[PDB]
Structures are given as structure tokens and as C-alpha cells.
Amino acid sequence: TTTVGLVCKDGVVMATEKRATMGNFIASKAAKKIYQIADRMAMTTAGSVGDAQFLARIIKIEANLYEIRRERKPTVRAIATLTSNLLNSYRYFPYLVQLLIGGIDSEGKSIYSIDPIGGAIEEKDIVATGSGSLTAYGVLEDRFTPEIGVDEAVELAVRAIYSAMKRDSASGDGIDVVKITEDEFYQYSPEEVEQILAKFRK
Amino acid sequence: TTTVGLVCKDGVVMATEKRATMGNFIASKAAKKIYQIADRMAMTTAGSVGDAQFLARIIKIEANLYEIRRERKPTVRAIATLTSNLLNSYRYFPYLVQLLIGGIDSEGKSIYSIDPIGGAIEEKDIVATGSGSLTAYGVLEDRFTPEIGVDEAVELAVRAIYSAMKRDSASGDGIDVVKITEDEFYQYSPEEVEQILAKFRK
Amino acid sequence: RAITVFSPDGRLFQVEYAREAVKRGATAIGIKCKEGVILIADKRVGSKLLEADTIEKIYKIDEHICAATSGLVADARVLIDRARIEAQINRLTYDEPITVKELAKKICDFKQQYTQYGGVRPFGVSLLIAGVDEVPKLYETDPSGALLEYKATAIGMGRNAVTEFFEKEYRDDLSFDDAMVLGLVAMGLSIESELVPENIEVGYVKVDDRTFKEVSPEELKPYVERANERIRELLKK
Amino acid sequence: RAITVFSPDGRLFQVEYAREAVKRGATAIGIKCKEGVILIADKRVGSKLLEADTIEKIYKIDEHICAATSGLVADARVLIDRARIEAQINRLTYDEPITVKELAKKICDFKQQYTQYGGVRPFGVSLLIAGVDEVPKLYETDPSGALLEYKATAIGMGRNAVTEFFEKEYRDDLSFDDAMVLGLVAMGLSIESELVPENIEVGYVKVDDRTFKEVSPEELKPYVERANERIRELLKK
Amino acid sequence: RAITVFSPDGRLFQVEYAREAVKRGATAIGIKCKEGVILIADKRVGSKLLEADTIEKIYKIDEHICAATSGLVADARVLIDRARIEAQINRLTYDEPITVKELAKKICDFKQQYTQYGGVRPFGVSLLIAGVDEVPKLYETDPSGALLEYKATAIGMGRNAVTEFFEKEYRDDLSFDDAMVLGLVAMGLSIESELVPENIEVGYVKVDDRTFKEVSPEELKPYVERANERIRELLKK
Amino acid sequence: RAITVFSPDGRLFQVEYAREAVKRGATAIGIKCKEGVILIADKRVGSKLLEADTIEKIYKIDEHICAATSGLVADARVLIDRARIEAQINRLTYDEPITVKELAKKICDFKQQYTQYGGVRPFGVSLLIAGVDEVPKLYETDPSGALLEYKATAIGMGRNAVTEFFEKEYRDDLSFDDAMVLGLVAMGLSIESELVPENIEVGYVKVDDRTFKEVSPEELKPYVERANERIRELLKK
Numbered sequence A, B: 001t002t003t004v005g006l007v008c009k010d011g012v013v014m015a016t017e018k019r020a021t022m023g024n025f026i027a028s029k030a031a032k033k034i035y036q037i038a039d040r041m042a043m044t045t046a047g048s049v050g051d052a053q054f055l056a057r058i059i060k061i062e063a064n065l066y067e068i069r070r071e072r073k074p075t076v077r078a079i080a081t082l083t084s085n086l087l088n089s090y091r092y093f094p095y096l097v098q099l100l101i102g103g104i105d106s107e108g109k110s111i112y113s114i115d116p117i118g119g120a121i122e123e124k125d126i127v128a129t130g131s132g133s134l135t136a137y138g139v140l141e142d143r144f145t146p147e148i149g150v151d152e153a154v155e156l157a158v159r160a161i162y163s164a165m166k167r168d169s170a171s172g173d174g175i176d177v178v179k180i181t182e183d184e185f186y187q188y189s190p191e192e193v194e195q196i197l198a199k200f201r202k
Numbered sequence C, D, E, F: 001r002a003i004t005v006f007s008p009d010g011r012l013f014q015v016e017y018a019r020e021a022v023k024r025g026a027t028a029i030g031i032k033c034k035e036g037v038i039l040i041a042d043k044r045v046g047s048k049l050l051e052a053d054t055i056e057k058i059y060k061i062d063e064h065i066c067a068a069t070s071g072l073v074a075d076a077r078v079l080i081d082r083a084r085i086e087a088q089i090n091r092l093t094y095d096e097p098i099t100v101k102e103l104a105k106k107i108c109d110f111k112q113q114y115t116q117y118g119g120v121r122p123f124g125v126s127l128l129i130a131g132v133d134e135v136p137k138l139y140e141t142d143p144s145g146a147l148l149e150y151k152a153t154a155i156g157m158g159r160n161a162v163t164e165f166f167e168k169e170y171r172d173d174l175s176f177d178d179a180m181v182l183g184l185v186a187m188g189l190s191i192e193s194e195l196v197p198e199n200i201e202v203g204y205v206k207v208d209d210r211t212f213k214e215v216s217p218e219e220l221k222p223y224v225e226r227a228n229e230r231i232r233e234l235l236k237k
């Protein structure tokens, strides 16, 4: 697993690959690791499949209910705080998961990286997660600039996750990308991604 | 144990062998490892016999009750989500079982592989489970094509589990197969299977 | 000075009052023959605004068991769901379908409690539980928790009408179709007129393939028709 | 101002009212002789629509114990099941069948609580518990939880009739068949007429093979017949 | 001598009194056609001091479900929140939206309990639950927990007025706009006059994109206008 | 025969009686304009022995929310603390201040329970909750748990007076100072005379720096003065 997230001047970009493993056994070439929480909020999940999936459902349901009840969309801060508390409450038998929750809201643009114990770091620019994160961080910290725009940011994202797939056997098989602009919450589809990494080597 | 599942263009196929072991002791040559959940839904069980059997009962009962109460048949997704949650709730003393839940429903055709912690992967084509899965994956990933039809898919299934029995002392003794077409939920009977693997070597 | 208590007569007024509720209930009929058991209910509505095609009066408890209800409609709901749970539980613990007789005893025991535990009131509902164990069976329940096995009977306002009728027409050797027709007739006399297939519900469980099926409106036409026959004729006096 | 409380007379009206319910109950009889104990119950129904061949009025509690009931039918159900559980529990803890006397005390204690615990009402039922420990035994219970050991007795509406009769005819040395016939007769006088084997139930437990068996309708014919004899004769005055 | 208990008539006065509360409630209407289901509610206020632009009378339960309420306003709140939770729970456990029918049964079961559990009172409220499963659906609930599926109906004081009207005008083939206008009209007759777009709320769920949307005040103008037409006309007698 | 139950009229007497208590309460007023929302309360005392400089009638719930109360003074206390807790809990779980609307719904739900749970009584208090989410907001609560959003209103004995007044004078475009003065006047007519800055409390929350501040006695002088003006004038009839 490897997922990245970057806060651009005009939005937010988040991407992950599709591999799921159990040891060296490749259990899945198309695991879903990116979820939509609100209209302009997404979440990437690294860690225990069952734990992440379980938490994802809780996150969604609560975001929904929040809005339906208060007729306001929940801010990423709210969801991040919510999730932190839940994670930390289980600190003595934590959910083995690394979460990335971000998007655009009344407060602005932001991304939160959250660990098993509910420790949340507010990502003001770049962030990678999963077994491949360290390689991904390589290119991200190399080519990133605060003025980067979501459109080239998705290229950058594919770029980083592509490098990571080259040195992390636990990563690979493909890549999902998501752009969160404001006028939209877009998900690139295999074709579009396949054509973006085509300007690289595969 | 070794069970396979494949989503064909015209339905779903699932198969398993009949061996049950405790160490090297062959406790059973005819263990049941394939259950019917709904009219067009089946489940294969790998793992702890007791745990699997227990969970199987719960799964069936809840599938029934769901329908009897809502007068709608539960989707595989609904049963898979239900099972994932149950499994994960016991994540600190998990039911040692690998489940395969699939069939046809209003949403289409699909198979889910679920682990002790409730980690569910949506199988869009091929899947193997159990101590022999890795060998089975060999032939499955070799001869499978998305256009494969359920009829040749049951041959493929028998083919893979047959290879697996050759290198997994924990697998063997015979093989159950199930075809889930729509016009039917068929179970081949020893005779028919014995005649399908007859075109192989035994 | 409590809730459900004994009167000097040795009776439970709350239970009897509950019974008054079932009498006001929509009528439901049950007939048992060798080939199986039929349950037919008055589906009739009082406004063109109600989705008649939807309204359900005969419930599936398990594969081989169905039930009809009469009395407080809301109470009835919890009671059949209760029966449903009860049925699955039997499966869960013995890996076997519950017998109609057992299922009945269980919801009756359930109902009996709300009959002697102060902070609660009785269920203002009566039930017709039909299914096929090794032989067709029909039971009817009372707000008190009393259980009774009938060959044929009814609950609801039209009770007495159809009871008196079956008391004369019913026969241990009726055929499935005969038995059913005899039932649509009882209903007819009950509502004091010919029946409209479009507003009556029929469900059954045949001893051959022990599975609750519900008569389709089309499959009804002939039966309703052949029943309206003897109804008109019978509505002479 | 509560529920089951003391009256200035020092009596519990709820318990007494419950007793009124048992009086209205169908009549049941029990006779004990040296060879065993018989329990016979009125199985008569009020409609040809009820499955008479099914209706059971004498219940098996354990291998060597059976019981008859009278009063609120639903309450009775929970009470015999309660007795059944109680019996098995004895087996579970001592690996031995419970004595008839012990079993009786236990359900009586059970009933007694519903007699002094505010949020509940007494059981509107009386019981006849018969079995064979080392000697035949017969006990009858009261809604209050009072226990009594009888040589012969009855509960239900026909109570007094058969009570007065046994008071004269019963004898410590009756034979099994004599004792049984004496019972069918008491029943006959009770219902004010000759008995129909088809609507009376008989169960017993002989001291020889301490196991509850129920007299078959065929084995009944002779007894009912020989009883209807002295009945007609006795129905002179 | 308790709370919600049976009367000698076999009725629950508390439940009936609760119903009296709903009758006093502001009126709400629901109409179902092939293209979807509309829910329109009387938003009229009695003072220029109340924030009219805010007051909400049609609630979103889930993406494909909305509901209107009538009766005790505070009870209603907890009831729709309850329905909201219920909907999300379904998603949480099956990863699928709850059907309108199921949701309805659930809050009705919820309400039913407050009908037979001593230390609580029934909900003085009635609900209109509209949504689109695979087909448009409309259900109305009662303080007792009774559920009913309607093609068209209303709750609240203006009930009868619009009920009698729909009883004549409603048609199974109405178009979406026709169906809606027929509803604004029913409302008009109800309040005994022409409607003001500024004080009526309309929400719906079209079978095409199963998502609850609420008619904007601007999109209302034309409909209210075309309705006020037939209203004035209809207000002749 | 319980506590808070339905009357044949479909109303809750306990809730209505509670309302009688709020009527007897000291009057409180709230006015909303574009620049914010003001809350002014009658601080007048009946003895020179009470510490007037201390007595607080306008409470701070959070940084952007305040509230005024009327009815049983003790009940009010637990209610505002309840509201305070509620506010902090929102921060604790979402790391964000609770909206004025949400906070209102929550205490209203709280109060609603004491309206249908037998072993408790309703809160003899009504609340004025003012604050600024993204726009100024004003809500008033009822003993039943009913919520209402006003542009301007009052609770307490002087209710009607200021209500009728605002009904004529209030305007959507009032300036902050105008709006406030209009309020002091309403108070004046209420108490039937000119106001004394020393015995009235004023709190507000301006849309610019969303923080509850309370008008100091000195900052009051001018407003009270300019208000007493129109008061004397208005006290002609």
C-alpha cells in the first residue's frame, strides 16, 4: 500500500494504488483504498483491510447523519476530530490503520493524516501513507511547490505512486486518483490514469 | 482445504474439495464446505471447522430472516457487509475462517473473499481460498478469461482444485462444484464431477 | 389496584377487554384438509387512496408456516416478527425448522406474560397460525395466550358467521380446491355478499412441497367466481 | 393500594379470585391405590371443529411423573413447563429423578411468590401432580402455593361431586382397575351422565415400572363401559 | 390504574387521545404518481415575527426518503431523528439504503412500544413517509404504531377536506405536475382559500434520480398560480 | 393515572400547567437585526436587601451564544448548565463550536423527555437562545420542547405587551442601536413605565466578532435614556 495527498492552490488531490497483500501473497490487484466522505471530502485507507473497511463505514454514516441532522456539511476538521477520538478510545487494542481525510470546506483546503492511536497531523502540502510512502515521499518532496495546481498535482501523484510501486512489493497493480476542486469531486477512471502514467514508462 | 470462485459472463461458479484435517490426521474425506445462503447465493468456508460451521448457521439464519421480514432477497453486498462487521467485532479473538460469499443479485454478479478480521475483497473474476489456494491460483490465472462461461468455468474450477490436491496434503478426497446461473443454482453431484475430472487424469 | 388482576369472578378483565379488540378486527379464515391448509383474509379497504395491491394480511413466518392476525394492528406486527425470530432461533439451535405446534406454544407463552406482569398490557390480538409439519396444521391464539387446534375456523368480526357455516359445511375429506372454495364462501357470507378477488388475500401450504405460497390474483379469479356462485345462492334467506 | 395484599379478614383477595378461576376450570381427577396412581381428565370439546384427538389434558412431567391442570389454561402451560424444567434440573444436579413430593413443593414455592411480589399476579390455576416415588403419590396445588397430599380427589367445576362420591366409595385397598373405574364413575356423576371414551383422557404410573403411560382409547373401552354401568345405575336419584 | 390500558370497549384511550393531538396538527399532504411522490405541507405562520423562510415542515430522512409530520411538535422531532438514525443504521449494517417500507415499519414498531409499556406515553404524532424504492411509495403512521400505504392522503386538521377531494379527483395516471397541482388544490380547499407560495412547503422524490429535492419558492410560483386557479373556481359552493 | 398523559382534548396538562409557570416569570426580550442579536432582561428586584449588581439574567452558553430564561428559576439553572455542557461536548467531538440552531434542538430534545417519561415532571421554563452562526439567530423554547425561530419576541409576563409592540414597530432593516432601543422601549411598555438602567440587563452577539458581550451600565445610560424618551411619549393612551 501507498497513498498520497497534496494540497494545491486550487484544491486537493489524493491517490492510492490497488494492491492488497497477506505476506507475499497478492490477495487483490484492485482493492479500493479511496472513499468519498462528503461532497468535497475524500479519505484514503492504509493498513488492515478489515479494520479500514470497518472504520470507513462508520466515518461515512456519521458524516451523513451529521449533515442530514444539522443541515450543514461537516468540516474536514470535524470528521478528523471525530475519527481521532474514536481511534484513540481504542488505544489499547487499536485499529491498525493509517488514514488520510481531506478535501475542501468552509475553513479552506486541508488534509489530515491519522494513525491507529488517533494522532492527527494537519498536512499543509504533501503527505504519503502506507508501505510505499517513503519512496513516494521522495518524488513528492522533490517536485512539489505550493503553487502547484490540482491538474499537475494529479500527475505528480501518479508519478510518486509509480516510483513507490518500483521498490515496494506490497504496492502496485494500478492507481486511483481523485481531484477535489470545488466545482467538482472527480475520479479519473483507469483510462485517464493509464494515459497520465503513459507519459512516464508504463 | 482449497476453494475457488470465478465470475463468468453468464453467472458464478464456486467449488471446494472434501478434506478436513487436524495435523496430518485426515479427519474427513467428505466435509461440506459449500453452503447455500439465498436462491442465487453461495458461500465456501476455509479455516476452523467449528468456527466456519458456526458462522455458516448465523449467516443463513440472518439471510432468511432478512427476506422473510423485508420481502426482498438480500444482496451479496448486504450479506458480505453483515459478515464483515460480525467478523471484525471479534477482531481480538477472531473466528479463524476465510469466507467466500457470492452469487447473482439485483446489482449483478459478484464474489467476496472475507478474512478473520472482516476484510472483504470484491472478486471481479478469480479467487482461491485455503491451504491449496496458491496452487489453484496457478491454473486459474493461467486459463481464465473474462468471457469464460459458467459451463467451462466449472471445468476450470475442477481443474484448479485438482492441481491443488497434488501439492497440498491438506486438500483432496473429492470436489463439490456449484453453478449459479439465474435460471438455476445447480450442484453437480459426485457422478457429474467424477466425469468432469475424468477428462484430466482421475 | 395494579393492572391485569383477577376479578371476583376469577377472570382477567384486561384480557377480556383485549378480546373485545379482536372482535372489532378484520376477519380471517383458516381451513385444513388432507392436501394442506389455506388461510384467507379480508383485504378490503375503505378508500381508493390506499394502495390495495400492497396491503398484506397473511404473513410468512418460515418456509412452511404462515399466519393471519386480528385485533390491534400494531400489536399484531410485533407479534408476527416475534414469531419469525422464534422460528429462526429454532433453526439456529437445532438446524431444523420449528414445528407449527411449537411455534404456536412459544408466541402463546410470550403473550401469556403480558397477562400477569404488572407494568405491561395484554396484546389486543388473536392469531391464526397455519403450516405443514408432517401433516397440515391450524392453530388460533387468544390475547390470554390460550392455544387451540382447529380443523377450520376464523377470528375477527366475521367470526361467528363463518364458524356457524363451517359447523355445517366443513368435512374432513374436502379436497384442496373444495376446502378453499368453502372458505371463500364463508368469507362471502361473512361480509354479507359476493367477494371481489381484488380485495381478499389467500395463502396456503400444501403437504406435498411444504412451502408457503400465496394464491395469485389470476389464480384466484376461478375460485372467487365459483364461490360467488354458491354465495348468491346461499344469500337467499 | 398495591396488588396482592391482606384484607382486614387476613385473606388475599387476588389469591381467592384466582381460585374462582380454577372452579370454572374443566374437571380433573386423581386416584391412588397400592398398584399406582391414575389421573383422569375431562377431554370433552364444544365443537366438531376442534381436533379432539389432539387436545391433551394430562401432562408428562418426567418418566415417573404426570400432572393435570385446572384454571387459566395459558397460566397452566407455563406452570407445567416450569415443573418440567424443575424435574430435569434435579437430574442435572444430582443425576437422579426428582421425587413427586419435592417437585410439588418447588412449583408451589414458585406460585407462592406471585402471591406477594407487587408487580405480578397469582397463577389462576390448580394442579394435580401424580407419580410414583417408592410408593404412589398424589398432590394437588393451589393458586396460593399451598400443597396437599390426597388419597383421591379432584379439581375444577366437577370437584365437589366427585369429592363427595370418593368420600363414600373410595377405599385404601382398591385394585388398580377398581380404583380406575371408581374414577371414571366419579367423572360420570360429575358431568351428570355416562362417559364417552372418545372425550376423556387417562394417564397413570404403576408402582411396578414407575413410568408414566397413558391409557389408549382401545384399552379405555372396557373401563368406560364397566363404569357407564354403575353410572346409569347411580343416576337414579 | 396504570397508564396505557384497555377500556371495556377494547380500545386504548391514551392512543386515541394522542390521535386527538394529531387532528389539531397543521395539515400535510402526500400524492403518489408514476414519476414520483410529492409531499406538501402548510408552512403558514401566525406572526410576522417568526422566521418564515426558516421553518421547515418536510424533512429529509435519507437521500431517497422524506417525511411530513403532524401532532405534538416536540415528539415529532425525536421521531424523525429516530427515523434518520434508523436509516443510517441500515447503511451501516448492509451497506445499502433502507427501503421506505422498512423504515416505516421500524418507526412504527418504535411508536408501538410507547403504547404498551407503563412508564411512558404514546407519541402525539402521525407521519407521512414518502420516498422511492424501485417505485414511488407513500406511508402514513398513527400514534398507535399502525402503518398504511396510500396512493394519496393527508394528516392534520385539513385531513378530511383533502381526503374527500382526492377521493374524487385523484387518478392513478396523473402526471407529476398534474399530481402536484392536485395537491396544492387540496391544500387550498383545506385552508379554505387560495394559497400563497410564500407559506407552503413542497418536497418530492422522482423515480428517475431517487433523490429528495425540495421545490424552490420560484419553481413554486407557476404551480401555486395554476392551482389557485382551480381553487377560486372550486370555492364557488 | 400516571403523570404526563393525554387529555381527551389531545393535550398534555402537565406541559400546559408548566406553561402557566413561565407566564408568571420575569419578562425577557430578544431582537435580531443584520448586525447581530440582542437579549435584554428585566433585572428589577423587590428589596434593597438583594445584591442587584450581582443578579444575572442573561447567560453565556458559549463564546457566540447566550440565553435568557423564564419560569421556575431552579429548573432554568439546570437547563442552561445543560446547554453549556451540550455546547462543550460539541467542541470535544468535532473541535468546533455548536451552531445556535443545533444547541436549541438539543435542549429542546432534553426537555421533551421530561414530557413523556412517567417518573419525572416537565421543566417549568421557557428559553430565549441567541447567538451568531454565520448570521444572527434567535430561538425561543417551550416547556414541551417545542422550538421556534423569531426575528424578535419575548417570554415572561410582559410577553404579549412587547409582542404586540414589535408586531408594529419591528423592521427587518433596523440598525443595531435602533433594534436595541426598540427593545428597551418594548420593555418599558411591558413594565408600564420608564426604565432604570440600574435594573435591566442587556447582552448581545454582533455578527462582526461573534462573541457574546454584555452592555455595561455606562454604555446603557444613553440607550435607556433615548428609550425612556419614546416610552413616556408612548405612554399617552
Ligand SMILES: CCCC[C@@H](C=O)NC(=O)[C@H](CC(C)C)NC(=O)[C@H](CC(C)C)NC(C)=O
Pocket: A001, A002, A019, A020, A021, A022, A023, A027, A031, A032, A033, A045, A046, A047, A048, A049, A050, A052, A130, A131, B115, B119, B120, B121
Ligand atoms: C484494501 C486497502 C487496505 C490497505 C492495504 C495497504 O497497506 N493493506 C493491506 O494490503 C494489508 C497490509 C498488512 C501489512 C496490514 N493486508 C491485509 O490487511 C491482509 C488482508 C487480507 C484480506 C488479504 N491481511 C493481513 C493479515 O495481512
Ligand SMILES: CCCC[C@@H](C=O)NC(=O)[C@H](CC(C)C)NC(=O)[C@H](CC(C)C)NC(C)=O
Pocket: B001, B002, B019, B020, B021, B022, B023, B027, B031, B032, B033, B045, B046, B047, B048, B049, B050, B052, B096, B130, B131, B170
Ligand atoms: C470443513 C470446512 C473447513 C475447511 C477445512 C480445510 O482445510 N479446514 C480444516 O480442516 C481445518 C484446518 C486448520 C489448519 C484450521 N481443520 C480444523 O479446523 C480441524 C477440525 C477438526 C474438527 C477435524 N482441526 C483443528 C486443530 O481445529
